[PDB]
């Protein structure tokens, strides 16, 4: 159902939290080869998460679930802000710019946490 797709989406978000925290530790420790790999893994997780979110939103639209559509539109907009910051972080890593990388890491943490405050409402509305 749209709910089992939402639980999978939630699990993928949690996988990203796990891999992100491991990546942050590796960045702090100077292990650039590990960071590179975690960044690739986070990019794949973003693509998969986005695909699950799009299927949930499309199914809520086809079901006429107006409140779920509203909440999913808001959440996906914030999700995309996160993804844009993530892309800038990857670019800073490629460019050898640790100052910007650290800043984007902190910013991405705050933007993703902001979007997660909509999760309980979405789960209830689906």
> 45 or 122: whose CB is closer to ligand FA0?
45
> 10 or 69: whose CB is closer to ligand FA0?
10
> 66 or 106: whose CB is closer to ligand FA0?
106
Nearest to 81 by CA among 107, 61, 120, 99: 107
Cβ 89 to ligand FA0 shortest distance, Å = 8
Alpha-carbon 48 to chain mean position: 10
Contacting positions for ligand FA0 (CB under 6 A)? 13, 16, 20, 42, 45-46, 49, 82, 86, 108, 112
Q: How far apart are the C-alpha atoms of 53 and 10, rounded to whole Å? A: 10
Cβ 33 to ligand FA0 shortest distance, Å = 18
> How many CB atoms neighbour CB 50 within 10 A?
16
Alpha-carbon 55 to chain mean position: 16
Cβ 64 to ligand FA0 shortest distance, Å = 27
Helices (H), 30-118: 32-62, 66-94, 98-116
Beta strands in 32-109 (DSSP E): none
> 70 or 78: whose CB is closer to ligand FA0?
78
């Amino acid at each position: 159902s749209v709910k089992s797709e939402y639980a999978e989406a939630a699990a993928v978000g949690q996988e990203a939290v796990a891999v992100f925290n491991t990546m942050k530790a590796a960045f702090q420790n100077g292990d650039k080869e590990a960071v590179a790999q975690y960044l690739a893994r986070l990019a794949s997780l973003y693509t998969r998460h986005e695909e699950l979110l799009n299927r949930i939103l499309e199914k809520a639209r086809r079901e006429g679930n107006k409140e779920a559509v509203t909440l999913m539109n808001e959440f996906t907009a914030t999700f995309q802000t996160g993804k844009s910051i993530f892309n800038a972080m990857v670019a800073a890593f490629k460019n050898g710019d640790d100052d910007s990388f650290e800043s984007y890491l902190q910013a991405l943490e705050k933007v993703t946490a902001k979007g997660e405050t909509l999760a309980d409402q979405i789960a209830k509305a689906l």
